[PDB]
Design a protein around this ligand. Structure first.
Ligand SMILES: CCCCCCCCCCCCCCCCCC(=O)OC[C@H](COP(=O)([O-])OCC(O)COP(=O)([O-])OC[C@@H](COC(=O)CCCCCCCCCCCCCCCCC)OC(=O)CCCCCCCCCCCCCCCCC)OC(=O)CCCCCCCCCCCCCCCCC
Ligand SMILES: CCCCCCCCCCCCCCCCCC(=O)OC[C@H](COP(=O)([O-])OCC(O)COP(=O)([O-])OC[C@@H](COC(=O)CCCCCCCCCCCCCCCCC)OC(=O)CCCCCCCCCCCCCCCCC)OC(=O)CCCCCCCCCCCCCCCCC
Ligand SMILES: COC1=C(OC)C(=O)C(C/C=C(/C)CC/C=C(/C)CC/C=C(/C)CC/C=C(\C)CC/C=C(\C)CC/C=C(\C)CC/C=C(/C)CC/C=C(/C)CC/C=C(/C)CCC=C(C)C)=C(C)C1=O
Ligand SMILES: COC1=C(OC)C(=O)C(C/C=C(/C)CC/C=C(/C)CC/C=C(/C)CC/C=C(\C)CC/C=C(\C)CC/C=C(\C)CC/C=C(/C)CC/C=C(/C)CC/C=C(/C)CCC=C(C)C)=C(C)C1=O
Ligand SMILES: CCCCCCCCCCCCCCCCC[C@@H](O)O[C@H](CO[C@H](O)CCCCCCCCCCCCCCC)COP(=O)(O)OCC[N+](C)(C)C
Ligand SMILES: CCCCCCCC/C=C\CCCCCCCC(=O)OC[C@H](COP(=O)(O)OCCN)OC(=O)CCCCCCC/C=C\CCCCCCCC
Ligand SMILES: CCCCCCCC/C=C\CCCCCCCC(=O)OC[C@H](COP(=O)(O)OCCN)OC(=O)CCCCCCC/C=C\CCCCCCCC
Ligand SMILES: CCCCCCCC/C=C\CCCCCCCC(=O)OC[C@H](COP(=O)(O)OCCN)OC(=O)CCCCCCC/C=C\CCCCCCCC
Ligand SMILES: CCCCCCCC/C=C\CCCCCCCC(=O)O[C@H](COC(=O)CCCCCCC/C=C/CCCCCCCC)COP(=O)(O)OCCN
Ligand SMILES: COC1=C(OC)C(=O)C(CC=C(C)C)=C(C)C1=O
Ligand code: SF4
Ligand code: SF4
Ligand code: SF4
Lengths: 70, 115, 176, 156, 215, 171, 96, 318
């Protein structure tokens, strides 16, 4: 044997592992490494648009702190 | 945009697989190979003849019951109202009406298939 | 003497009624069947590793035919045609004449193996143990004509399989 | 030549794929189908070789004629052989399917299924053992391993 | 067809999936055995009965041998008759395994088939050891039997018999109390005793209706 | 012409492009097709005839057809719409050359186009099928057995005597 | 006792002469069991037995890679066994 | 970079389906006292590759009586829909983040039946038509109960977003709050995927090959792939719905491993169920779904509407 079914199960598990970590890593890579923003409502979209406008490089994930307030 | 892209990608993958299936292998088609299958003997009639449905009443009842699904789906949002008593009364009223309709169809032998 | 197979009556008390309700609502016997399949999953299978392992056989096994010889090298067959007369499928053809030394020998001994039913009647009828069914069973061919044996092929089969045919006959001839 | 090497390797790949995935039709006639079942039984487990029965002729690669073919049955056998998409193979199992057998001289029996369809492998016996049928199937696999379609196409 | 049990052309008239008429067309395995028997001696005709019912072989041999013995006015020795009954019961085991497992396979349960075809293999081994053929033995003959049993056969038969009950129990656990199996089998194919008698039924097809009969 | 021929099947398969290109609308070609079974029987009879040792035979059909009418009849038996249009010789040669580059069996070739649009010679001085005891089978009696495979489901059951045989340029 | 079966697998690997022989027998015969050598043919076939297995798996043969004229590294069949070892291997006798 | 994500979502699923074929064969074999594929490739690991290569090099058949357009459309639609119904699943991050992901799954799953319908009808054969009619009956049997079970379960989630199911089950699995609904949902998912004991559209012993009897080679392979992809996808949906894994924003790999393990367990349970039981009659499935599941589902819908209001446990995100 019953343990010779295990290789196929392991191959299936390895194949099914790929989508989740692929999505996680691609989200991190394209969003500054910080967990791509979620906008279910218009308020969050407005926050994202304000961030993009004040970024100066037209990317929302570029975050400005107190050093931009002088 | 993204959903349109993924729909196009999936449909293109399926179509490409069909094209591979139909253009790669060697084809030898003759009349006997493409005849309909009926366990080795020729069919008596046509497959386009009427085929009786013994569960037509259940089909119409499913048509009617499918719209109560649309009526009941906004319940997670309706639960957030301030006047919860009216909302609960109306949800229970709708579900009781649906259950009574099911009971009426059941007791008059509406769920039994035609023989 | 007889017995009934489905003539029993269920108990009507509250305990058994609740037990049957719980069985209906919680799928007890279905779980039992799942458990039986699970137990079978953990047993050793009965499969053998063919062709490296073979299924058991016995000395009586009736396989491919062969014609035999005496220890001196002379053929055992004397063209009596008893096997031909007894063959239930008419799968044997025999022609004979006196040999150059006056012996009684066949000039044609053919067995159609697509007519044969492998009953073993020929080797029961033979009085000199000339024709036998050997132990071989892996002699599938690619053409129909390769299964129409003549005297040369049968004598070759005897010469090829005698080492096992004699041993199998030795282990069983006391049952005959 | 590079092209000969490429076509040889592709032919090997296609032959391996074909012989390692043989799906016979769920088809039996007489006593020999019982030995076919015992071939499918756990002791021999033909599925372990990649051999799976499939009911539809459109999803089958091999036809095993297991039993006597009568005159009444011959058109149906030919019809279900014709509906198999190619490539397709036929295995003749037992004396009745090979040459008529015990019923060779009868008025209602076809003297061998090779009068109706071409046959790749003849398995002798009445009935052949499940081991003998397995030997025939493996011989058919070896025969499929020997075919040269792409090489002959290239030599044209 | 997988569920046609061989060569059967059931022409069926249906309204939807309801069966209005069944017309079984047979003769796709008619090989003219009786005329062929007319062209053979009594000994030469015995192997045909092996191939009549290729699941109950020694039983057909036994029936033919009993008929020939009655016509010949001879009596087999007691040991031959005991061997005949023993192998008839083994053959009954084989036949009932085939029947139940393939009926379940037609219904949709495939596992018991594989569970019991190993027992079928062991019984085939018994057949081959006694006769040299796994299924077409021609062992039972009008004089009795062809050969005596090999010196170590009864021990192996006892070994098989002392364990077959657990296999029957596992099959019963798989099927008997399953509610799906009951829904597929209960009240299906009901036949009355009078109709069974008038239609020429025999065997279990009588005993299932309550008729107390057994040859 | 026959079930596995490249004559009737070739013209029937032209439906896939939508129109049938015919040099000069096929009005300057004459064809005399012959059945396959007649050819095979004639070969057998030539083998079994002792007088045919050094002879030369011409196996031709009982009717001569213009190419346009032959293709029209082929399309009528197959119940496919017929849309013939005239294509010049050099354009057709170009198309054939384009198709010739197929490493598999080419759909058409320049040689095939040349042979399709050439009339069949008449050789009355040579013996034919009727000198070997064979009566030539007309195409109108055997065209359905080749062309029923090219029909759609709506027309699969149409009988042989439905499609009104074509006109022959005989004598 | 999981460790015991793991060590049994390790000795199964080692008993085939290392990883090379282990893989050769795994890809040639689809079986890595280790038995007692009963004998060797003049054609090269080796015969192994293991009475701890159930009836049917207690005897087996590893076919030679080269018989009379053909390469049998991959192409093997049951007709390759000579008659004496044929009688032994099919359990028609108890004596090799 | 989004196309890379689509490819890395869709190719591994096809590989998993290919090897699920082998896993099913081996599990059934070992449950039946045999081995299953162990010859081609070590432990039969190359069996799916041989099966696919054989199928796609074999001749596909165009039935003379068939309707070619729908005959070719149906497997394309089946495979495309099976691939599409994977995009909103959070693992723990969805490829496409939807406000109403559950409704999207409902709609596309109800659209997937038309592949079987149109393939069976366009085959123009009797067994295919019987299979298609059985598909109609099966959908009518299960759809309403499926939808009501889903709504009753999501009444505790607060929304139709699939990601919120992660935060809802942070401390306890939803199996411990709605196990009767979960049992009914599991049976409904078995019926939705035409799996034993509800594999009536195929009906191997009854209808030869059922709705795909006329299909051969690659078009048949596509139907097989869609079937098994639907199996895996439905079990993943069940695992996300009732066995909620814990997610740490800084290590989503742990969530992915746990969720894949639960999905694999559910799929193996599917194969176990197939190996253990006989087949229903297709009217008995309708009676089971309409006379036993529906009243209980209505009562539990009432209960799950009343419970959060009774206990002041109403979820957020109006
Ligand atoms: C998931 C848990 C996996 C753990 C496991 O497989 O242990 C099997 C181990 C063996 O139990 P068994 O199969 O009943 O015993 C059969 C003989 O021991 C079999 O003994 P053997 O003489 O046939 O030796 C064969 C040996 C060598 O055989 C092999 O190497 C082939 C197996 C390759 C698998 C990859 O097997 C191994 O050493 C590897 C075993 C599985 C490891 C993977 O079972 C356990 O330790 C309990 C696990 C709990 C069950 C859930
Ligand atoms: C301007 C707008 C025009 C729209 C045109 C619609 C696209 C179809 C055009 C090609 C189909 C005709 C080919 C043909 O007859 O056989 C070819 C050829 C001839 O075979 P034959 O045996 O010699 O002749 C058989 C007989 O002719 C008899 O053969 P038959 O009985 O099979 O002929 C029936 C066929 C013949 O077609 C016609 O009768 C005329 C075409 C007009 C149909 C338009 C009706 C409106 C329906 C809704 C709108 C559809 C899309 C329109 C929007 C376009 C802009 C994107 O009618 C159809 O089946 C049309 C179905 C197409 C609708 C696609 C919808 C997909 C549904 C998926 C679910 C949707 C989810 C919601 C979102 O056979 C082949 O080469 C193999 C089959 C080729 C089929 C490929 C795939 C199917 C068509 C592509 C669909 C593209 C959708 C994107
Ligand atoms: C030996 O018999 C023969 C064959 O073998 C069966 C043939 O295929 C054949 C014809 C060769 C081809 C394979 C024809 C079939 C190809 C069609 C499907 C043409 C369709 C191509 C188009 C691009 C379709 C798309 C429509 C456009 C407008 C875009 C001929 C002539 C023949 O004679
Ligand atoms: C009760 O008997 C039965 C069984 O038991 C023995 C079965 O197994 C069984 C199932 C049939 C099996 C033989 C499985 C058949 C295997 C498939 C048809 C092959 C499909 C595999 C591929 C097409 C998947 C895609 C191929 C790629 C390799 C995957 C990656 C895709 C690339 C583009 C990357 C049936 C129906 C059955 O009836
Ligand atoms: C990229 C997507 C499209 C293409 C998909 C390709 C899939 C990958 C290919 C899979 C390769 C596996 C095949 C090789 C395994 C066979 C193992 C070995 O046994 O084969 C032997 C030799 O193998 C064959 O001779 C040749 C097989 C492969 C031939 C060359 C490989 C070509 C690969 C090129 C890839 C390009 C794909 C197409 C690109 C468009 C013959 O032995 P066999 O009879 O079995 O076993 C006997 C049984 N016993 C052992 C129990 C006694
Ligand atoms: C998702 C999984 C499936 C995806 C599909 C991947 C498939 C890729 C593997 C392809 C392996 C090579 C295929 C070879 C089989 C081709 C069919 C064939 O054998 O035809 C043989 C045929 C015989 O013809 P004749 O001898 O002239 O006529 C005699 C009969 N009168 O010869 C040929 O046509 C061979 C032509 C070579 C085909 C081209 C192969 C090149 C690779 C294509 C891969 C496609 C993937 C994209
Ligand atoms: C490489 C050569 C490419 C040739 C392209 C030809 C396309 C075509 O239709 O030809 C028909 C061709 C071959 O047929 P034969 O002539 O019999 O074989 C010839 C080989 N001897 O048949 C096919 O393979 C059909 C291919 C499928 C068409 C692909 C496009 C279909 C698009 C479908 C869209 C709808 C999908 C529904 C899902 C969407 C829902 C959200
Ligand atoms: C088939 C039917 C396709 C249905 C697709 C549904 C996709 C979906 O629901 O996603 C909704 C998604 C996100 O919305 P929310 O979840 O509310 O969040 C937004 C706030 N951030 O909305 C969108 O992205 C809209 C995108 C455009 C609409 C989709 C267009 C697809 C049209 C399908 C028809 C295909 C073309 C016609 C061919 C016919 C077939 C031959
Ligand atoms: C304090 C307030 C609480 C309020 C009360 C809440 C408690 C509720 C108590 C009752 C709950 C019972 C729920 C059960 C769901 C209905 C099941 C049922 O009763 O149906 C069965 C039938 O259901 C089945 O048998 C299903 C058949 C399909 C079998 C498929 C495989 C079996 C399942 C294996 C285990 C699955 C595990 C489920 C969970 C998986 C994880 C998600 C009845 O049918 P019959 O016996 O034929 O009789 C009907 C005529 N009288
Ligand atoms: C024992 O009775 C028989 C059957 O029932 C199990 C069969 O299915 C079949 C044929 C069907 C399969 C494919 C062997 C035959 C020939 C038969 O004799
Ligand atoms: S075994 Fe029987 S059928 Fe075969 S040749 Fe001998 S007597 Fe004839
Ligand atoms: S083989 Fe035996 S029975 Fe047959 S002719 Fe020769 S001696 Fe007589
Ligand atoms: S060869 Fe023998 S066992 Fe096989 S079908 Fe014919 S009579 Fe029956």
């Amino acid at each position: 044997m019953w343990f010779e079914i295990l290789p196929g199960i392991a191959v299936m598990a390895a194949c099914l592992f790929i989508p989740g970590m692929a999505t996680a890593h691609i989200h991190k890579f394209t969003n500054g490494g910080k967990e791509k923003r979620v906008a279910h409502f218009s308020y969050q979209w407005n926050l994202m648009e304000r961030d993009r406008r004040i970024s100066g490089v037209n990317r929302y994930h570029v975050t400005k702190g107190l050093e931009n307030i002088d | 945009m993204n959903i349109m892209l993924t729909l196009l990608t999936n449909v293109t993958l399926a179509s490409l697989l069909v094209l591979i299936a139909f253009w790669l292998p060697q084809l030898n088609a003759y009349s006997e190979k493409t005849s309909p299958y009926e366990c080795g003997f020729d069919p008596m009639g046509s497959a386009r003849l009427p085929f009786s449905m013994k569960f037509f009443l259940v089909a119409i009842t499913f048509l009617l019951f499918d719209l109560e699904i649309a009526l009941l789906l906004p319940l997670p949002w309706a639960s957030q109202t301030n006047n919860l008593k009216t909302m609960l009364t109306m949800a229970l009223f709708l579900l009781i009406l649906l259950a009574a309709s099911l009971a009426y169809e059941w007791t008059q032998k509406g769920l039994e298939w035609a023989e | 003497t007889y017995k009934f197979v489905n003539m029993r009556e269920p108990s009507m008390d509250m305990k058994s009624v609740t037990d049957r309700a719980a069985q209906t609502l919680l799928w007890t016997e279905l779980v039992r069947g799942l458990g039986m399949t699970l137990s079978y999953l953990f047993r050793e299978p009965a499969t053998i590793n063919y062709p490296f392992e073979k299924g058991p056989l016995s000395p009586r096994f009736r396989g491919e035919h062969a014609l035999r010889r005496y220890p001196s090298g002379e053929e055992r067959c004397i063209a009596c045609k008893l096997c031909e007369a007894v063959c239930p499928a008419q799968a044997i053809t025999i022609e004979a004449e006196p040999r150059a030394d006056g012996s009684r020998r066949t000039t044609r001994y053919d067995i159609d193996m697509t007519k044969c039913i492998y009953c073993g009647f020929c080797q029961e009828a033979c009085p000199v143990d000339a024709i036998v069914e050997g132990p071989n069973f892996e002699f599938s061919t690619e053409t129909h004509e390769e299964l129409l044996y003549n005297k040369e092929k049968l004598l070759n089969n005897g010469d090829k399989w005698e080492a096992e045919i004699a041993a199998n006959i030795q282990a069983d001839y006391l049952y005959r | 030549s590079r092209g000969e090497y490429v076509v040889a390797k592709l032919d090997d790949l296609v032959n391996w794929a074909r012989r390692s995935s043989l799906w016979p039709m769920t088809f039996g006639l007489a006593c020999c189908a019982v030995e076919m079942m015992h071939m499918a039984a756990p002791r021999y487990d033909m599925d372990r070789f990649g051999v799976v029965f499939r009911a539809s002729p459109r999803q089958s690669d091999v036809m095993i004629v297991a039993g006597t073919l009568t005159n009444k049955m011959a058109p149906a056998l030919r019809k279900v052989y014709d509906q198999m998409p190619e490539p397709r193979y036929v295995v003749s199992m037992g004396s009745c399917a090979n040459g008529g057998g015990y019923y060779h001289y009868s008025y209602s029996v076809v003297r061998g299924c090779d009068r109706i369809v071409p046959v790749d492998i003849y398995v002798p016996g009445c009935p052949p053992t499940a081991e003998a049928l397995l030997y025939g199937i493996l011989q058919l696999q070896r025969k499929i391993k020997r075919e040269k379609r792409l090489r002959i196409w290239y030599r044209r | 067809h997988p569920a046609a049990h061989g060569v059967l052309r059931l022409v069926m008239e249906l309204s939807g999936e309801m069966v209005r008429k069944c017309d079984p067309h047979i003769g796709l395995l008619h090989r003219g055995t009786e005329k062929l028997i007319e062209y053979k001696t009594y000994l030469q005709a015995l192997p045909y009965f092996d191939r009549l019912d290729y699941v109950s072989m020694m039983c057909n041999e036994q029936a033919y041998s009993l008929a020939v013995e009655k016509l010949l006015n001879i009596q087999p020795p007691p040991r031959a008759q005991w061997i005949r009954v023993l192998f008839g019961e083994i053959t009954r085991l084989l036949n009932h395994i085939m029947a139940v497992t393939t009926h379940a396979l037609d219904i949709g349960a495939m596992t018991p088939f594989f569970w019991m075809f190993e027992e079928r293999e062991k019984m085939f081994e018994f057949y081959e050891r006694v006769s040299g053929a796994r299924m077409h033995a021609a062992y039972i003959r009008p004089g009795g039997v062809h050969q005596d049993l090999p010196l170590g056969l009864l021990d192996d038969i006892y070994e098989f018999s002392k364990n077959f009950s657990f296999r029957i129990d596992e099959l019963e656990e798989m099927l008997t109390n399953n509610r799906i199996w009951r829904n597929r089998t209960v009240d299906i194919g009901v036949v009355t005793a009078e109709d069974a008698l008038n239609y020429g039924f025999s065997g279990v097809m009588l005993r299932g209706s309550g008729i107390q009969w057994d040859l | 012409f026959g079930r596995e021929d490249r004559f009737l099947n070739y013209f029937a398969s032209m439906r896939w492009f939508g129109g049938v290109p015919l040099i000069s609308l096929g009005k300057e070609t004459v064809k005399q097709p012959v059945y396959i079974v007649d050819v095979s029987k004639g070969i057998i009879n030539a083998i079994k005839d002792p007088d045919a040792k050094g002879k030369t035979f011409a196996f031709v059909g009982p009717n001569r057809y213009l190419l346009f009418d032959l293709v029209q009849y082929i399309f009528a038996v197959a119940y496919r719409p017929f849309l013939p249009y005239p294509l010049p010789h050099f354009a057709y040669r170009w198309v054939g050359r384009l198709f010739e580059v197929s490493p598999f069996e080419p759909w058409t070739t320049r040689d095939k186009v040349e042979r399709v649009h050439m009339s069949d010679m008449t050789l009355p001085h040579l013996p034919g099928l009727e000198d070997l005891g064979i009566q030539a089978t007309p195409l109108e009696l055997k065209a359905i057995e080749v062309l029923r495979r090219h029909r759609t489901y709506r027309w699969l059951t149409s009988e042989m005597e439905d499609v009104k045989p074509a006109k022959t340029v005989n004598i | 006792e999981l460790v015991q079966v793991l060590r049994r697998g390790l000795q199964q690997v080692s008993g085939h002469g290392g990883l090379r022989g282990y893989l050769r027998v795994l890809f040639r015969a689809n079986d890595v069991r280790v038995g007692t050598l009963v004998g060797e043919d003049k054609y090269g076939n080796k015969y192994y037995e293991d009475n701890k297995q159930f009836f049917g798996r207690h005897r087996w043969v590893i076919y030679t890679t080269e018989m009379n004229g053909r390469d049998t590294f991959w192409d093997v069949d049951g007709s390759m066994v000579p008659p004496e070892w044929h009688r032994w291997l099919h359990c028609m006798t108890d004596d090799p | 970079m989004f196309m890379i994500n689509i490819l890395s979502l869709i190719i591994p699923i096809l590989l998993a389906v290919a090897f699920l074929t082998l896993v099913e064969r081996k599990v059934l074999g070992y449950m039946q006292l045999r081995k299953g594929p162990n010859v081609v490739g070590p432990y039969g690991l190359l069996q799916p590759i041989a099966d696919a290569l054989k199928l796609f090099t074999k001749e596909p058949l165009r039935p003379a009586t068939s309707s070619i357009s729908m005959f070719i459309i149906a497997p394309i639609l089946a495979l495309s829909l099976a691939l599409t119904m994977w995009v909103p699943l959070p693992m723990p991050y969805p490829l496409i983040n939807m406000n109403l992901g559950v409704l999207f799954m409902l709609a596309m799953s109800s659209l997937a039946v038309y592949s079987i319908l149109w393939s069976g009808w366009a085959s123009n054969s009797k067994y295919a038509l019987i299979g298609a009619l059985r598909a109609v009956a099966q959908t009518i049997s299960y759809e309403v109960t499926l939808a009501i079970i889903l709504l009753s379960v999501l009444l505790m989630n607060g929304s139709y977003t699939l990601s919120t199911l992660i935060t809802t089950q942070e401390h306890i699995w939803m199996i411990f709050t709605s196990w009767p609904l979960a049992m009914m949902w599991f049976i409904s998912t078995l019926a939705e995927t035409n799996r034993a004991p509800f594999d009536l559209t195929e009906g191997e012993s009854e209808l030869v090959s059922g709705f795909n009897v006329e299909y051969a080679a690659g078009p048949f392979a596509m139907f097989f792939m869609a079937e098994y992809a639907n199996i895996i996808m439905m079990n993943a949906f069940t695992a996300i719905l009732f066995l909620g894994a814990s997610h740490d924003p800084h290590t989503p790999e742990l969530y992915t491993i746990n969720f894949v393990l639960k999905t694999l367990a559910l799929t193996i349970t599917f194969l176990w169920i197939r190996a253990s039981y006989p087949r229903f009659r297709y009217d008995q499935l309708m009676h089971l779904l309409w006379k036993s599941f529906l009243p209980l589902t209505l009562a539990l819908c009432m209960w799950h509407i009343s419970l959060p209001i009774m206990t002041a446990s109403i979820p957020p995100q109006s």
